[PDB]
């Protein structure tokens, strides 16, 4: 009986080797076939359309991460104060305010001890206000006085949080002036393209990210190499130059994508980093935006990132949640699914 066991075991192991091989060559040939079939644009379009239908039939659902309750609430109060006060400010006034805020943030970053003293939480903000107005009233505007007083009065977990709050207020003022000019979409697209190209060439991004080197040289590098171009929005250029000027302990591409995220969130929308092997039709884009908005309720600003490696299909990531329709992902699942 155990000899029968042994011979049946050898037979079954031969069977298993057969199955494993057959499966390996089968999946390889299937990959070749699909890649051959997906070369033509029509297959790409049809895959996108069917996946969009699948998303349409999908049912809806419900759902700054680094900051915490105190810091998040203080920043919310600061942005509300800005919305209230700087609403009537003029575009040139907005640029002046942004420049003053960036200069103040640079001063705080360079002068660590003053940042500590101004950032240490305190129930009574009167001393903080007194020191801030004593040191700044000389070289800032009244609206800047009010914004800085509001920021310092509130609470933050650490000094870096205060620096981030000041930079965020300046960036949001720049975005306010951008929307005032009516080119909000233009700056959105420019920022996203800049982030993508910066991610593509990590060498330049890392070179910029070195805060050890004086920031004037790096911002000049950005101006002459990338930010200085014919088709570059001036507002986006200024925002990116400011962001790189304040870079410290952060990598440039991450900062740029965060800039784009904040800019889109300024209108309340949520960015959906769509990925596909080819650009979609305008009707396809509208359908995608509508279906994603329905799924997540809030309007969604779809951003297309072409990547031929998906072999057709779409991959939509938003808020740490991903719907993966990529054909490459399906092929990987099929391969790993083999016995």
């Amino acid at each position: 009986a155990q000899g029968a066991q042994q011979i049946q075991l050898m037979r079954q192991q031969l069977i298993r080797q057969l199955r494993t091989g057959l499966g390996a060559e089968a999946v390889n040939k299937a990959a070749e076939i699909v890649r051959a079939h997906v070369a033509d644009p029509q297959a790409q379009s049809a895959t996108v359309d069917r996946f969009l239908s699948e998303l349409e039939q999908m049912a809806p659902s419900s759902v700054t991460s680094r900051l915490r309750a105190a810091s998040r609430q203080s920043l919310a109060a600061l942005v509300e104060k800005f919305d209230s006060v700087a609403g009537g400010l003029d575009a040139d006034g907005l640029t002046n305010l942004a420049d003053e805020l960036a200069s103040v943030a640079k001063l705080l970053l360079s002068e660590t001890a003053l940042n500590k003293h101004l950032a240490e939480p305190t129930d009574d903000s009167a001393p903080k206000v007194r020191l801030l107005e004593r040191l700044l009233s000389d070289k800032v505007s009244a609206t800047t006085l009010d914004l800085l007083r509001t920021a310092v009065s509130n609470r933050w977990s650490t000094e870096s949080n205060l620096i981030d709050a000041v930079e965020h207020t300046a960036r949001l003022a720049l975005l306010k002036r951008a929307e005032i000019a009516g080119e909000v979409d233009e700056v959105e697209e420019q920022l996203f393209r800049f982030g993508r190209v910066l991610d593509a060439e990590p060498r330049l991004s890392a070179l910029l990210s070195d805060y050890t080197t004086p920031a004037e040289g790096r911002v000049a590098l950005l101006d002459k190499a990338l930010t200085g171009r014919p088709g570059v929005n001036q507002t986006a250029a200024a925002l990116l130059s400011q962001t790189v000027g304040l870079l410290r302990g952060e990598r440039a591409d991450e900062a740029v994508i965060d800039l784009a995220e904040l800019a889109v969130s300024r209108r309340g929308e949520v960015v959906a980093h769509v990925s596909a092997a080819a650009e979609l039709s305008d009707a396809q884009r509208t359908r995608l935006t509508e279906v994603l908005s329905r799924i997540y309720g809030r309007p969604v600003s779809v951003q297309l990132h072409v990547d031929p490696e998906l072999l057709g299909g779409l991959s939509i990531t938003v808020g740490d949640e991903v719907i993966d329709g990529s054909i490459a992902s399906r092929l990987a699942a099929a391969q790993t699914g083999l016995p």
Partner: protein, 46 residues
Amino acid sequence: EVAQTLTQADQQLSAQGDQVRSGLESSVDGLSAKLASRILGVDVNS
């Protein structure tokens, strides 16, 4: 007895696997085509 049965089983198993490999080769294309057809949500005539 079991030793002789096992050695003959091994050699005939090698022969059977060898002759099965060719039979598998002539039929893998259809299996791969069906896989690629159903993976894409649409039939591929290839």
